[PDB]
Design an enzyme around this catalytic site. Structure first.
Site, mmCIF file in Angstrom:
data_model
loop_
_atom_site.group_PDB
_atom_site.id
_atom_site.type_symbol
_atom_site.label_atom_id
_atom_site.label_comp_id
_atom_site.label_asym_id
_atom_site.label_seq_id
_atom_site.Cartn_x
_atom_site.Cartn_y
_atom_site.Cartn_z
ATOM 1 N N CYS A 25 48.179 35.723 47.044
ATOM 2 C CA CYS A 25 46.879 35.567 46.403
ATOM 3 C C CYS A 25 46.793 34.291 45.558
ATOM 4 O O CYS A 25 47.627 34.039 44.660
ATOM 5 C CB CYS A 25 46.658 36.848 45.556
ATOM 6 N N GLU A 41 28.729 57.538 51.792
ATOM 7 C CA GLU A 41 28.482 56.119 51.456
ATOM 8 C C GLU A 41 27.236 55.955 50.583
ATOM 9 O O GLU A 41 27.222 55.139 49.603
ATOM 10 C CB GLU A 41 28.360 55.298 52.767
HETATM 11 S S1 SF4 Z 1 44.836 42.535 42.131
HETATM 12 FE FE1 SF4 Z 1 43.247 40.994 42.942
HETATM 13 S S2 SF4 Z 1 43.716 39.081 41.768
HETATM 14 FE FE2 SF4 Z 1 45.618 40.434 41.571
HETATM 15 S S3 SF4 Z 1 47.015 39.904 43.385
HETATM 16 FE FE3 SF4 Z 1 45.629 41.565 44.122
HETATM 17 S S4 SF4 Z 1 43.859 40.461 45.173
HETATM 18 FE FE4 SF4 Z 1 44.898 38.949 43.779
#
Ligand code: SF4
Length: 224
Positions: A208, A37
């Site tokens: 999303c 990390e």
């Molecule tokens: S890559 Fe990022 S912006 Fe695109 S669907 Fe996935 S979480 Fe959403």
């Protein structure tokens, strides 16, 4: 997106497409996860792997690192940049030798008390190495959560940071926590990138908010 759907979709993606063969993922220990990390904080994975392998060969345990001269640690770090990380690495190894008998501590407060280790790195060490139920919040994770849930505002403001920590806790499961936390880092590193994210490859694309509005550039917010 409902939180239980978020976690299930991320875990199903990880099973088929996630990274499972990095050196710090094989015969995992708190020491190996902590060392990886710190090296990964400001350096790409391809550059880190040869340095991780040289450090584990020279310093098989945290007591070996503690007992070495600082100048030898700095010499082996040469090329990784950001040497405050190496000065803090050596101090933290000495704290584990002195306070904890040479055995890496397994409680959140004792891990976060180490120099160079903040709230996200402490949760990473205990979740990835021992399965304890803590979320993470690095730059990769902030980008995925802020786009999926449309969290505007600069995360450098306390109220925005606190909203992101609460969201991360909500979507992070207990069963499979080690797989989920690595998967979130894989997604922000390779799919949900700073520019032009690869939404067609993303397991969150059906819920999303940024994807639905083509508005990824708004999230996370930038400093004013
Ligand atoms: S890559 Fe990022 S912006 Fe695109 S669907 Fe996935 S979480 Fe959403």
């Amino acid at each position: 997106m409902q939180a239980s759907q978020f976690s299930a979709q991320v875990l199903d993606w990880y099973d088929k497409y996630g990274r499972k063969t990095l050196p710090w993922q094989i015969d995992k220990t708190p020491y190996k996860v902590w060392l990886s990390e710190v090296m990964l904080q400001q350096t790409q994975v391809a550059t880190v792997i040869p340095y991780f392998e040289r450090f584990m060969a020279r310093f098989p345990t945290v007591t070996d690192l503690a007992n070495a001269p600082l100048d030898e640690v700095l010499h082996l770090w040469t090329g990784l940049g950001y040497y405050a990380r190496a000065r803090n690495l050596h101090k933290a190894a000495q704290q584990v030798a002195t306070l904890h008998g040479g055995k890496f501590p397994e409680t959140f407060e004792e891990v976060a008390a180490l120099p160079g280790v903040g709230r996200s790195t402490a949760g990473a060490i205990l979740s990835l190495s021992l399965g304890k139920h803590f979320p993470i919040l690095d730059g990769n994770v902030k980008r995925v959560l802020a786009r999926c849930y449309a969290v505007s505002g600069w995360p450098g403001k306390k109220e925005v940071e606190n909203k992101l920590w609460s969201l991360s806790e909500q979507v992070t499961p207990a069963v499979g926590v080690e797989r989920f936390n690595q998967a979130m880092m894989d997604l922000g590193a390779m799919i949900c990138t700073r520019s032009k994210p690869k939404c067609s490859l993303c397991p969150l694309q059906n819920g999303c908010i940024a994807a639905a509005n083509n508005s990824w550039a708004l999230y996370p917010g930038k400093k004013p």
